[PDB]
């Protein structure tokens, strides 16, 4: 009646300064940490406008979801606030190159900027705005869903190393899913009230709309 189901889960290190970084974030006492939303936004439109580019050649892309948009959903219940896009979502591959294994230019360039004074807001400027994420969560999860391959599920607890394997949970259409389980002195970031009031103030002008779901 229930045969026993089996997952390989793979777990990389993450490369050297991309670790360090992490390490500086979700320890960091930064008073401004409310960025980190803009900065997943963000990456949202992001993959928004490479799923609409693609669209501009080959309409049958968005088959997986005509409408492109960002929704927020707060869940006081296991203290999670997450981000979800129907943008173009990732590959296996993305997520193991891009999310952790391979260096970027820009995470020690932002280490060096901030040693040299820089604010730790200016994080997407150097491109590893995503890993603001650990400024108010403990454990990031990340599902995402790239047309014509599976949906794969990306976590790490900032630990050093992160997993990656075939996600068995709740099928979503195209796109990804950033899932930050909030660190428990940070749980005001699933209020409603304090939602709309840091989109409003560094999230006003994006190109795609962006919906609160509430309850
Ligand atoms: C965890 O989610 C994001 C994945 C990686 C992001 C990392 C490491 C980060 O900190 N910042 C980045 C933001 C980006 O927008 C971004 N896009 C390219 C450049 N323009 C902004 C100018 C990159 C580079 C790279 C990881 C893109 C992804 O590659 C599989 C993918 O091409 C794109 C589509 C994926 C994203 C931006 C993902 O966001 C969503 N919502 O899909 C960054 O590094």
Redesign the pocket.
């Known amino acids: 009646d229930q045969p026993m189901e089996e997952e390989e889960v793979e777990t990389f290190a993450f490369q050297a300064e991309i670790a360090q970084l992490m390490s500086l974030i979700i320890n960091t006492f930064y008073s401004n940490k409310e960025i980190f939303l803009r900065?997943?936004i963000?990456?949202?439109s992001?993959?928004l406008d490479?799923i609409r580019y693609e669209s501009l050649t080959d309409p049958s892309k968005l088959d997986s979801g005509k409408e492109l948009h960002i929704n927020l959903i707060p869940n006081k219940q296991d203290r999670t606030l997450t981000?979800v896009?129907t943008?173009?979502?990732?590959?296996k591959a993305?997520?193991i190159?891009?999310?952790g294994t391979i260096a970027?230019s820009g995470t020690k360039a932002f280490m060096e900027a901030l040693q040299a004074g820089a604010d730790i807001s200016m994080i997407?400027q150097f491109?590893?705005?995503?890993?603001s994420a650990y400024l108010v969560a403990e454990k990031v999860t990340?599902i995402?869903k790239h047309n014509d391959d599976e949906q794969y599920a990306?976590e790490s607890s900032a630990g050093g190393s992160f997993t990656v394997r075939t996600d068995t949970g709740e099928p979503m259409g195209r796109?990804?899913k950033?899932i930050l389980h909030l660190k428990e002195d940070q749980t005001e970031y699933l209020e409603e009230r304090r939602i709309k009031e840091i989109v409003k103030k560094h999230s006003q002008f994006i190109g795609y709309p962006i919906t609160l779901f509430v309850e």
Do not use: H, Q, R
């Not at 943008?87 to 590959?91: A, C, E, K, L």
């Not at 491109?127 to 890993?131: E, I, L, P, R, S």
């Open positions: 900065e997943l963000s990456n949202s992001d993959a490479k981000i896009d943008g173009i979502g990732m590959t993305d997520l190159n891009n999310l970027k997407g491109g590893v705005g995503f890993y990340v995402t990306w796109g990804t950033v």
